[PDB]
Amino acid sequence: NTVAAYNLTWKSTNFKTILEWEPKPVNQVYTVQISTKSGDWKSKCFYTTDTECDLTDEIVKDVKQTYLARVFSYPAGNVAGEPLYENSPEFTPYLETNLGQPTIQSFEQVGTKVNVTVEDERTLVRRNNTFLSLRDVFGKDLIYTLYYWKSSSSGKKTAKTNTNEFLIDVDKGENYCFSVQAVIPSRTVNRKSTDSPVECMG
C-alpha cells in the first residue's frame, strides 16, 4: 500500500532550484531523477524520506533548456507490484525562475538631480571560470522601476531604466525616500519581484 507522489513543484529564485512534492512518507521511500526535454535520465536523490531535492547543479549548466523531473515511490522497512511514479510539469529556468528582492546601493544629490544606483547581484551561473550577475544573464530584458515620494507625505512618482542607474530631477527643498522593484515585461508568468527596503535621504 504505497502511495504515489503528487503536486510536484519547482521552488526557484534567481536560479537556485529545489523540487518539492507531497505527501510525507510512512514506511515509504523516494527516488528523484532529472533529464532535459531531449535526453536521458540522471538520478540525483536516492531512497530518501525527504520531500525535497536540490537540482541547482544541473539547471545552471544551461538556463535556456527545458527540464522535467520524475519521482518513484518504494516500500520501506519490514513488510509489491509494478514501479509507481509521477511526472512534474516542464520548467524553463530563463523564463520562470523568480526574481529576488532588489537593494539600493547608493543615492547622491548632485545639483538639481539625484543619482540612484542598484546593486548588481551575482548568481551561481558560471562561465569562463567566473560567476555571472543578474545583468550579465538577462541583459536588455531586465527592467528596474523607481518609486519616489517626499519624506512624510503620501503620493509617489515613478521612473524606469534598463541599466543600473536612475537620474531624477529633485525639486530643491524637498527631501525624498526611495524603493525599487525588478520586472521583466516580456514574461507571461513570474513577472515582478517584491520591493526593496526603503531608503530615505536624511
Q: Tell me which amino acid residue 88 is.
A: S
Closest to 17 (Cα-Cα) out of 55, 64, 50: 55
- How far apart, in whole angstroms, are the C-alpha atoms of residue 161 and residue 168? 11
C-alpha distance from residue 132 to each of 15, 97, 122, 138, 144 (Å): 11, 15, 6, 10, 19
DSSP letter at 195 equals: P
Domain boundaries, the chain: 1-96, 97-201
Backbone angles phi, psi at 15, to 5 degrees: 85, -15
According to CATH, the topology of domain 97-201 is Immunoglobulin-like (2.60.40)
Beta pairing partners, 6: 22
Q: What is the dihedral of CA 175, 179, 185, 187, to 10 degrees?
A: -170
Entry field: residues in the chain: 202
Amino acid identity, residue 195? D
Q: Could you give phi then psi for residue 141, rounded to 5 degrees?
A: -70, -30
CB 41 within 8 A of CB 33: yes
Reported structure resolution in angstroms: 2.4
| Alpha-helix residue ranges (DSSP H) falling in 88-199 | 93-96, 134-138
Q: Which amino acid is present at 115? A: N
Q: What is the largest CA-CA distance in the chain?
A: 79
CB 146 within 8 A of CB 192: no
Q: Which amino acid is at 5?
A: A
SS3 95: helix
Strands (E), 27-175: 28-36, 42-48, 52-54, 67-75, 84-87, 104-110, 113-118, 122-127, 130-133, 143-150, 157-161, 165-169
Pairwise CA distance, residues 99 & 182, whole Å: 7
Q: Which of 152, 124, 147 is nearest to 196 (CA)?
A: 147
Domain 1-96 is found in CATH 2.60.40.10? yes
Amino acid identity at 85: Y
Distances (CA, A) of 29 to 42, 44, 48, 71, 170: 18, 14, 5, 10, 61
Q: All 3 cell numbers of residue 39?
A: 535526453
What lies within 8 Å, CB to CB, of 52 at 6+ separation is 11, 18, 19, 20
CA-based R_g, the chain, Å: 23
> Do the beta carbons of residue 129 and residue 135 sit within 8 Å?
no
Q: How far is CA 104 from CA 77, 118, 141, 150, in A?
A: 53, 5, 20, 17
Q: Which helix (H) or strand (E) holds 58?
A: helix 56-59
C-alpha span between 193 and 181 (Å, rounded)? 6
Decide if 1-96 and 97-201 have a common fold: yes
Distance CA 52, CA 19 (A): 6
State yes or no: cis peptide before 23, omega within 30 of 0.
Answer: yes
